[PDB]
Amino acid sequence: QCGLPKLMALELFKPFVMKRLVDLNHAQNIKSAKRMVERQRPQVWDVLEEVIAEHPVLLNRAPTLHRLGIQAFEPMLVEGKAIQLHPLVCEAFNADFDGDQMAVHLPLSAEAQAEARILMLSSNNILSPASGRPLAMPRLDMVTGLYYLTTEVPGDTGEYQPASGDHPETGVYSSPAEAIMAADRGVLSVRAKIKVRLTQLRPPVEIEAELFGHSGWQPGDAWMAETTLGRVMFNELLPLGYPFVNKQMHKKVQAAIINDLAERYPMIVVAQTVDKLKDAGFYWATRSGVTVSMADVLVPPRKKEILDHYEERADKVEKQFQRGALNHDERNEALVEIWKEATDEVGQALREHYPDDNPIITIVDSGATGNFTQTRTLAGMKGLVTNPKGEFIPRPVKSSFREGLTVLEYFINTHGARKGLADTALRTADSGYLTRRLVDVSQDVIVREHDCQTERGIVVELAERAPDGTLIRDPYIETSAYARTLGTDAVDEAGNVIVERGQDLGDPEIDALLAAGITQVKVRSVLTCATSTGVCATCYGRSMATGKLVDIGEAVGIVAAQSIGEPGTQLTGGLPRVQELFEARVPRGKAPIADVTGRVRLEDGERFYKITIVPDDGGEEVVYDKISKRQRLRVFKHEDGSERVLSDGDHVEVGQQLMEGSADPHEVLRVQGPREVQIHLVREVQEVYRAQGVSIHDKHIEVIVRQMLRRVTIIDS
Amino acid sequence: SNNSVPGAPNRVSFAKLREPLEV
Amino acid sequence: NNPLSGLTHKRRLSALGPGGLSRERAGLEVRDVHPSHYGRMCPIETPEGPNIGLIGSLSVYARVNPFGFIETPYRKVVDGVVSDEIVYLTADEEDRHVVAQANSPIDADGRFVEPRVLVRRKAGEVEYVPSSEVDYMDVSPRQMVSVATAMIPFLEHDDANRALMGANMQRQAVPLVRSEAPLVGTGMELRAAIDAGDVVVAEESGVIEEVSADYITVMHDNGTRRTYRMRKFARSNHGTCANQCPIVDAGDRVEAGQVIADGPCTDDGEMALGKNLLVAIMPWEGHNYEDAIILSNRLVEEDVLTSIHIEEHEIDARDTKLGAEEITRDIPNISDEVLADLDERGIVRIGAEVRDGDILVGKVTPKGETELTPEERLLRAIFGEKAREVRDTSLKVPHGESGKVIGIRVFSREDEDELPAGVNELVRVYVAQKRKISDGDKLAGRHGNKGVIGKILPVEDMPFLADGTPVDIILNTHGVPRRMNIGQILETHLGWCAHSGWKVDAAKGVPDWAARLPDELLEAQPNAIVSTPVFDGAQEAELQGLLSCTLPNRDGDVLVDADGKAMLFDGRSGEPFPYPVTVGYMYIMKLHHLVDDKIHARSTGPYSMITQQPLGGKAQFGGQRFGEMECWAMQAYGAAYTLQELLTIKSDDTVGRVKVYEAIVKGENIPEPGIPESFKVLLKELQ
Amino acid sequence: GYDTPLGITNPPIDELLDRVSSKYALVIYAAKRARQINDYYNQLGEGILEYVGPLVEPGLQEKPLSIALREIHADLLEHTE
Amino acid sequence: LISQRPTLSEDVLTDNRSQFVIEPLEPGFGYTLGNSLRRTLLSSIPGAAVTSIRIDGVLHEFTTVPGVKEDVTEIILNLKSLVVSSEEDEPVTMYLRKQGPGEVTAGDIVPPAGVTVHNPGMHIATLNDKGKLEVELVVERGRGYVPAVQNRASGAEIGRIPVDSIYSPVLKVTYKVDATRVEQRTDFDKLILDVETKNSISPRDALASAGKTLVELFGLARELN
Amino acid sequence: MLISQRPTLSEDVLTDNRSQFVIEPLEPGFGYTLGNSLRRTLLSSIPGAAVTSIRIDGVLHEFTTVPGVKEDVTEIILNLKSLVVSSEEDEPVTMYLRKQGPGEVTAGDIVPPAGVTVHNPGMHIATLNDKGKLEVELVVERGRGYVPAVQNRASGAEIGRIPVDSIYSPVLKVTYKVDATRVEQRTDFDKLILDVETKNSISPRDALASAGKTLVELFGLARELNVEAEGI
Amino acid sequence: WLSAASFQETTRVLTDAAINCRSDKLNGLKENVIIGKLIPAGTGINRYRNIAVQPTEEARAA
RNA sequence: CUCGA
Ligand SMILES: [Zn+2]
């Protein structure tokens, strides 16, 4: 639902209202029916309500970065002149309420209304199409409200007491309704730990097995739990039959639940469950006592002692600069590391001094909003500020904003603050320019076939095995392994296959291969998809927004271009590095590569650097010439030691990175082949977005690289 | 007091530093 | 918009223009703060749009020498001794010396307390230096900020980002019906109001001979009389109401240079950009969720945030090819009921309330017979109305406008009034609307804390204090510690102490926290006014101490705690809120971004003649632009039919848009889209 | 196994995706049937060969898109791809 | 632990403020009763207020009167403070004629039979030698707050100036409860309701009106289906 | 004042002892005013009877385990707390529950003295072990609302008597919410929704009617002051 | 050439388009948007677009 | 030209 003003709906639905004014005989002819809407005769407000009934509208907030920037809603006639927006779709629109405006568009044709009702409805688009993780979830006040009641308090009133002496067990309630009556009178706290007999909540799959196991828990069966009254009220919100969760509801915990609800439970259940979480979060956020006051901003206890110790070290480095023992360029770097270490000690002096009841800590630690770096700046010290040059000033801002900056401290702070806002307008221009280049290069990439049948795929590092024998989950599972489809049966040490070919890698199906010992899978990729123009659905995989296999006809290329260009607003590598990769430029790093596998011949000096390689089979020596300003990459030598700095005698493979930097993708193609240069571009782009906190599935990056290698040149006619 | 020159309302200042030169 | 916005405009320093630079020719180096801008150009007050850094505001004490450079005053230090001798130094002249910060500890004789003091050096170097090295020092702490920036209390507790917005939004304040000076001030509000020129200051001392709402007469000592005329309900450049009101009464001795009458956003001679509102910092049922604001309906019932706005409407009667347009009450095919508010000339009468669509000036233009539609000529024959060769071109009220007609101005060529050649008559109608605060209007404080109005609860729904007084505004707590604008919290604390008053324990000496406070601050009556100068003013130690000795109410009970929080009751349920909540008074301004102007909608309307696409802008009754990025969203959804519908029948299909309108009023289905007229123009241009 | 669908969420979008192959195909099924119902209401007073009326019982002043979306849900229509 | 019927007794503080104690009430019941009375008091107590005014020399709010210090807008804002009661429950007109010099107060109004001004000392306008103020004041009776009725909705002509109407006669309402939490067989809550009015009615008359409002309203749950 | 007519009360019956009531439409914003009052009146001001204290033979200074039955002490107290009962005598009434031999104990296996009535005879209480015996004494009193066990410490005699939480109130769980409903043109009018789940002692209909009677009497104390006017 | 001339370097594309005398098969997202056809994607592809819906033979009495 | 997100 959304709320639009009555005066907006009257003009938007003006011809429809005129039609109904003449049907119900409120107006003689369609001509006078128009004069009635223009004059706003009182009959139109009763007629307007009938018209907009179940007629969806489109809401849009510019900039339209991804497809969720436009969503469909059911209009509800509200008084006033402002549009009423649902609090859960704020994340998709990136819409705060500090003066934002949105546009409304009314679909007319039957097909357009059906496209809004089915394809664009806000309830049918809970997940992010870029990453598959939910967006319409508790985010600000709601997560704080839920984090409140799902907290265990050791000393809270009404807490369970073990039977001792003449009195039996205190704090064991027969029904949750009794616990509510206890909390109403004032005996029990919602956050106090107790024992309750539950009868309408499935116990955890851990304890459901020992109580029943043979048959599933039934609505009506009883069981005891050691939770709080709030945690029971929270578990009532999620649908019936969901395993009880006795955790503290952090944002990560709530996101995990909603992600699991979207995978297993149907769409309409997720849409209604998250509406319950919203109402419950806002209710308890009101009564969670979250407030900012000058008393709650606690200052570090050892504030003077810490700064005086580093003022001592700064005065010693200043005296080490008075005798000329330190270069002027080195004195700044020396003081920078003194004050960087000083801000870390003040930050640590704040974490331990601040209680967990303090609302400023509760906001940050519950995943609501804000960093502790902001909290440190608030109560501890601003730290080293940057001048318009870029390097940190050798003198930091010792005061905190709670204390109050001095005149010169404030003046030097504005230098970094203004240039922080200034370059943001230029960085968004280059972001949007890169985005529209990606849109045009992949605009016509459509899913036209169900399965192209090619057994080709690519190997994905599912997990890494430690020396002891434990298998460590690979960090790239989320973006490269999940939501894929298999192109080769997964075989463990036994002859049995765990997952068949062509099965969407769900959440438990990854743990099936994880617990089977196998650490590598061959999955179907859009890179290897052999189709004339578009791509097949089987090689694409699961639609991150739909949670199922992609439908035939979905413009996955535009979705991919939007998925990459939406987070491009925040970068430092950096944004030019992303442009260096997508434009196939000869990079700044210009790192060399091993054209032929063999033996390393390191002939290093100081005037320059030259390195040869004896081919491991035939061939002749290949001589290079490199500047001494670079350094060799620690190559995973055959010795199984990854930190083997490339010295002469190492056994490097073909297409191995020699020195650090960025290897020329043009040269990577003419060495290892088109299949490998595509993998290089994918995880090289992915390293830039991963190093910023943005999770884009490799699927979308691969859709762009597929278009970069569609053409070949002619050598002989 | 703050700005006792034109005949304004008596706004009391938390001033620790004197103003040597008026605006 | 308000007197402060005008004062700031006359003190702007613009890099753009002839002889300066182009906007396309301005890198990130021309825009950022330079160390020589200290005390000359403000580093805070600058727009955040594409003109960031290119437009600055002159510092307070700064001045310009006949050469063109900007001089700033400094106190000449002889031999480590502060002197009252003040000299203005240019940018390079300042670099040839070293200057001490304004807040330096100084002996009563003038000698610096510490040998090493924070000193600014050439190339933007800040470091300690011997007391025998200081050549000059700053005049005032606020020497580096602008007039608007110097109006932010506890500015030293707000980051530069929100401080920039705080000063930029003060210039966007709307003059209210009645004005309240802020409880927590800075001292700059007085000189900012007087030097702006929107008040009435007495030139010469004397007594008030006669005072009226129309004019003020002053009887001087020598015997002469000067009479100052009040500007009443005048329309400003931006539609705000510039209205002056006398302050003095009959027979009041008034000195020279004293404010005898104050105008918009002024109270007793001080800038009153907003109102003092009782604020509570708590989330409330999601209505204040991320920067939305909850308001008490008392602000609507008592016109606390009501503002007057005046629009100017204009139309002229010209000479056409087939005659001359005439302004007449006789309009073809209009009842005597629509024309009931018009006088005998066809002009709306003074005092009439006019909604949108109402006629303001009745003008008819003669249309030729050869310009008639076949249906229109048949429709003229089937009604027997001959001699109607004129059509309706009357001045009507635009969509979204409504108010009382307050003034009419008529200019006629017949009556010696010099109109442009080809014009016979000119009429201007002034309409005034009284705008109460509405859901969606944009409010903001002085610390860059902005937000729209999300909900206006009834007075009983509001969380109320122990004695039954409900709060006025509820601000979400989540949007406070991110922005680094603690100044709003410190203002709330000091604001409450100003509302209630305080009394420091005098027995057993002066306490250790109030040792630095002036003796005038040890006692305060309720509703007292205070000053927190920029980079000076109240310290948190003194603020914490004042909260401990706040005066009790009329019943003798102290409502807020020494922490600054108070116990609130849920007005909807009755149960008291489980935890104490920060409660106090904050100065809130009504910004000139109101939903009454920003709402717009269009079914059909005018189309651009060349491209045959709908017009743009609200004033032209245009449509919204489904841009390039929005088409990518439709394609990403696969909404092919919605996308085709938007770009054809709903935009520039000349025959498709008409047949769609007929299909709707007929109840038929939507027809098939045709070919866009804009694509036809593209081909004719490639040719 | 869910709360009663209110407003535009009825019929549930999950069940509607069962009688159809994809989200996009359901759009055309509902829109073309909605045009049939609208042509029935406009050709009920005149002419023969009018399109098949509402297969299910329509509510008062119900949009043809809603009627069509329930007839699709009740397995009363066919298709031709 | 059995029932004893609760009792309501009045205590007077001033001529327009009274406290009301209601005991004994069930534990946790006192806060909800005080709220339901406070919400009904602050919103639904009948009273009278001025609907529209009419000054002879003016035709709209945005102008001045010769000789008076306040513009018509400021005079209307001062008239929003007027407290008045009316017996007629129908539109009735108040008049005010005053020749300067001097100050026009609320006592200078001549109310017709049935209505009466309850603060004759309220400042309205300041008049000099040339000042003359002649005002008509329409007073109706309603409840709550109704904004100024438009001239397009009413039959009022150009001269009339509609004003906002604040009909509520109660000024400030609060409450406190004293819970008896001594662990024993007897626990009870005592509600202390505090009611302040604006001299239009007495505090017990307001509480009586809120009593009949809630007795009538809660009687909807007593009727069976 | 002015007339405010057409507020009606409808009932949707979920289960036999749980119904949803709607009061629609109410003037803005009276739903909130009376929403919390109707709930607190239901939950805390309806006369009912419940177990005040119990005493188990063979349980003196332990309170950890009862020999001869699978359930321990606190599990016996729980299902005994949920025993629904009604009495016509205001003074406390002592009941005895005794059964021997292997089998199962129910609330029907109790012997109720004249005046009291057990409404859930099929409620499980305890499983009797082989050659098992269970004697227990129950104390039933009348009261309103919910009173903790600690306040029933004086009701038990110094001889292995344990006090229990008394769920006197016949209703178990009540929640309310307020929505919007437009009567004519304005959408401000409130619609109150009450959800009351009660025991089988009385239906939700009579529970609401009992709360209304006690509320009309409560605000009647204020109405008796002057008898002035107000629109209906 | 119509999808390219609307992206970058309009004159550089239109010159080579007229010299090589290129003919544009109007089958693409960007092209159909310009001329007003249904985009060959989503509900615009021929698989979903040309679909006939007919009621099952069961019908009511009236 | 200036401003709003
Ligand atoms: Zn494929």
Author numbering:
A (entry chain D): 440 to 1011, 1026 to 1170
B (entry chain C): 28 to 50
C (entry chain C): 443 to 1129
D (entry chain E): 28 to 108
E (entry chain A): 2 to 226
F (entry chain B): 1 to 232
G (entry chain D): 1220 to 1281
Recite the paper's sentences.
Bacterial transcription initiation is carried out by an RNA polymerase (RNAP) holoenzyme comprising RNAP core enzyme and a σ factor. Group-4 alternative σ factors—also referred to as “extracytoplasmic σ factors” (ECF σ factors), based on functional roles in response to cell-surface and other extracytoplasmic stresses—are only distantly related to group-1 σ factors and are substantially smaller than group-1 σ factors, lacking four of the six functional modules present in group-1 σ factors. ECF σ factors comprise only a module related to σR2 (the module that recognizes promoter -10 elements in group-1 σ factors), a module related to σR4 (the module that recognizes promoter -35 elements in group-1 σ factors), and a short σR2/4 linker that has no detectable sequence similarity to the σR3/4 linker of group-1 σ factors.
Because the P-sigL transcription start site (TSS) had been mapped only provisionally, we prepared and analyzed a set of downstream-fork-junction nucleic-acid scaffolds having different lengths—4 nt, 5 nt, 6, or 7 nt—of the “spacer” between the P-sigL promoter -10 region and downstream dsDNA. The resulting structures were essentially identical for nucleic-acid scaffolds having spacer lengths of 4 nt, 5 nt, or 6 nt. However, map quality was highest for the nucleic-acid scaffold having a spacer length of 6 nt, and therefore subsequent analysis focussed on structures with a spacer length of 6 nt (Mtb RPitc5-σL_sp6). The structural organization of the ECF σL-factor-dependent transcription initiation complex is unexpectedly similar to that of a group-1 σA-factor-dependent transcription initiation complex. σR2 and σR4 of σL occupy the same positions on RNAP, and make the same interactions with RNAP, as σR2 and σR4 of σA factor. Despite the smaller size of the connector between σR2 and σR4 in σL as compared to σA (20 residues vs. 84 residues if one includes σR3; 20 residues vs. 28 residues if one does not include σR3), the connector in σL spans the full distance between the σR2 and σR4 binding positions on RNAP and follows a path through RNAP similar to that of the connector in σA. Inside the RNAP active-center cleft, the σL σR2/4 linker, like the σA σR3/4 linker, makes direct interactions with template-strand ssDNA nucleotides of the unwound transcription bubble. The interactions of the σL σR2/4 linker with template-strand ssDNA include a direct H-bonded interaction of σL Ser96 with a Watson–Crick H-bonding atom of the template-strand nucleotide at promoter position -5.
